Amino acid sequence: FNILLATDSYKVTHYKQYPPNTSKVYSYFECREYEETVFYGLQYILNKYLKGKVVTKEKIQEAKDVYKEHFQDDVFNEKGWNYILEKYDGHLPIEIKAVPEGFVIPRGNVLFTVENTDPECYWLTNWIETILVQSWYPITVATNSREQKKILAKYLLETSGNLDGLEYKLHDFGYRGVSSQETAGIGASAHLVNFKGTDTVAGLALIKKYYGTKDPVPGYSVPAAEHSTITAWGKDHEKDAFEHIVTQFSSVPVSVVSDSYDIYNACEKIWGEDLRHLIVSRSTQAPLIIRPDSGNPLDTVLKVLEILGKKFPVTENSKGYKLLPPYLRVIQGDGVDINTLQEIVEGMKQKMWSIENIAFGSGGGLLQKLTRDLLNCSFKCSYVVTNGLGINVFKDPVADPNKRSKKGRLSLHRTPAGNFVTLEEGKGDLEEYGQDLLHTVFKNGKVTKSYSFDEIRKNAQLNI
C-alpha cells in the first residue's frame, strides 16, 4: 500500500492551485440534509492506511514514476512528500477530530474534521480526502441496517409484546454480492454493530483486529443448506436430501432451502406430511428453519405460513397473533431490502401472523445496493489560513442550495433539549454550549483515541 498512490489523480496537482501563503487547510465530513446516521468505520481506516511511517524513499520514487506517465508531465510534489519523510520520519502531520464511533447523529452535522499541523503541509488535508470519504460505506451500511432493526423492533413488539430474538432477525447473506473481499469485511462489520447473525466470515477478523470484543466472536451462524446440497440428490430425491440434512443436524437449528422445485409442495407434502415426524420431535433450541428463496417475497411468505399453519399445531399468543410451534420457523432470504422488509412484516401483521415466526436474510440489499449519495456523505474545506489570517470558506451553487457547505471552524454540541447542533465560524469557542463532542482520534501519525466494538454497539442502541 502506497498512500502517495491512494488519492484521486487530480489531487496530485492541487498544491499548485491553493492561494499563495496558505499555512492551514481545515476540512470536515458530514452526511448532508434516513434522518440520523451511525458513525462507524473511521478507526479501521486510521489504523490500516494512515498511521505510522506511511512515506518511504521507495514510495516517493514509485509515485514519481507512475505520475510522470499518468499525466505525461512532472506535476507530482516530490519536495512536499520528501519534506514529510525527512522532518517527521514519514508520519502524517495531520490532526483528525471525530465524534465517538457508534454515535447516532442527525443529518447535516459535523462528524469529523481534518487539518494539517505543519504549515508546509497545507496540501495534505485534502490529499487524504479520497481515503477518508470511503467511510461513507460503513456509515451507510450501519445506518441502513439500524433502520431495518427499527422496523423489525416495531412489528415484533406489536405482534409479540417483547424484543426476544431481535438481534438475530436480519442475517447477512451478502458475501458473494459485494464488490470485493475488503468491502465484505467492512460491510459485514457495519451490520454487526446492530445484529449478531452473519454468514460473511470476513467481518469477524476485521472486528477482532481493529475494534475488539469481550466475547470470542461478534457474529454467529447455524448450519444451512444451499441449492447444490439439495439438487445434487436428483429432482426425484428432494425428500431424501431433506431427511439426510435434518438428521445430520438433529440437535442444532438448521435452515433448509425448500424452493429448488416447488416450495408449496415441499411445505405441504414433504415437510407437512412425509417428514413431519422428524420435525415435531425437534427441540425449541434446534428448530427446522424453512427457507423460501424465490417469487414475490410477501406473497411467498404468507402462502408458506398458511400451508404450515394447516399442517402444524398453531397457537395464539397474548397479543392475538398466530404462532407456529417452537420447533418450526421461517427465514425469508430473497428480495429483502429496507422497502420489502417493511411490506413483509406489515403484510404478516394484517394476516394476524406474529413476527416471532420469521427471520430475514439479506445479501446485495444489505451490503451492495447503497451509494455515497444515499446519506449525501461529503468532505469539504471550511477554513483556511492565508498570510496569517483565517478565512471562512464554503461553496454555495446557485442551482443547488442543498450543496451549500458549512463555514469556518466547526464543533458539535448537545443542545439544552439534548439534541445536536453544529456550531460554525468558530462559535464553539464561546462556551455557550457544553464541551465539543469531537475528540482528537489522530495526530501526527498516531491514533490517539480508540473504541472497542462493545462501546460502538452500546452507542448505536435503539431507543425502544
Ligand X SMILES: O=C1OCCC/C1=C\Nc1ccccc1
| Residue 398 burial (10 A CB sphere; 0-12, 13-18, 19+) | exposed
Residue 301 CB contacts under 8 Å (≥ 6 apart), including other chains: 292, 330, 332, 344, 347, 348, 358
Looking at beta carbons only, is 115 or 199 nearer to ligand X?
199
| CA 227 to chain centroid | 28
Residues 6+ apart with CB under 8 A from 191: 141, 142, 145, 170, 172, 174, 198, 200, 203, 366, 367
Task: Supply 186's cell numbers.
Answer: 467492512
* 8 A C-beta contact, residue 361 and residue 377: no
Is 372 labeled as ligand-binding? yes
Could you tell me the smallest distance in angstroms from the CB atom of residue 225 to ligand X? 7
CB proximity list for 396: less than 8 A, separation 6 or greater:
403, 404, 405
74 is in an annotated binding site: no
Q: How far is the CB of 311 from ligand X (least distance, A)?
A: 21
Among residues 291, 322, 329, 406, the one that binds ligand X under rule CB under 6 A:
291
Q: How many CB atoms lie under 10 A from the CB of residue 451? A: 20
Nearest of 186, 85, 99 to residue 145 by alpha carbon: 186
Q: Which of 394, 449, 431, 453 is nearest to 99 (CA)?
A: 449
Site track 64-103 with ligand X (rule: CB under 6 A), x = hit: ----------------------------------------
Cβ at position 254, least distance to ligand X in Å: 8
365 binds ligand X (CB under 6 A): no
Q: Please tell me whether 414 is known to bind a ligand.
A: no
What the block records as the C-alpha cell of 348 is 404478516
Number of residues that bind ligand X (CB under 6 A): 14
CB of 253 to ligand X, least distance (A): 8
Binding residue for ligand X (CB under 6 A) from 75, 153, 222, 374? 222
Per-residue contact string for residues 241-270; x = within reach of ligand X by CB under 6 A: --------------x---------------
Binding of residue 229 to ligand X (CB under 6 A): no
Cα(204)–Cα(212) distance, rounded to whole angstroms? 10
Q: How far is the CB of 301 from ligand X (least distance, A)?
A: 14
Pick between residue 34 and residue 168 the one whose CB is nearest to ligand X: 168
Cβ proximity to ligand X: between 333 and 365 the closer is 333
Whose Cβ is closer to ligand X: residue 3's or residue 331's?
A: 331
Residue number of the CB atom closest to ligand X: 255
Report in angstroms how near the CB of residue 168 gets to ligand X at its nearest: 9
Burial of 359 (0-12, 13-18, 19+ CB in 10 A): buried
The identity of residue 403, as a single letter, is K
Q: Report yes or no: 274 and 313 within 8 Å, Cβ to Cβ.
A: no
| SS3 category, 60 | helix
Considering only residues 133 through 192, tell me which ones interact with ligand X, judged by CB under 6 A.
171, 173, 175
227 carries a ligand binding annotation: yes
Residue in 333, 335, 365, 408 binding ligand X, rule: CB under 6 A: 333
Choosing from 99, 156, 289, 301, the residue that interacts with ligand X (CB under 6 A) is 289
- For ligand X, the binding residues (CB under 6 A) are 171, 173, 175, 199, 221-222, 224, 255, 289, 291, 331, 333, 361, 363
Q: Which residues are annotated as part of the binding site for beta-nicotinamide D-ribonucleotide?
A: 199, 291-293, 333-334, 364, 372
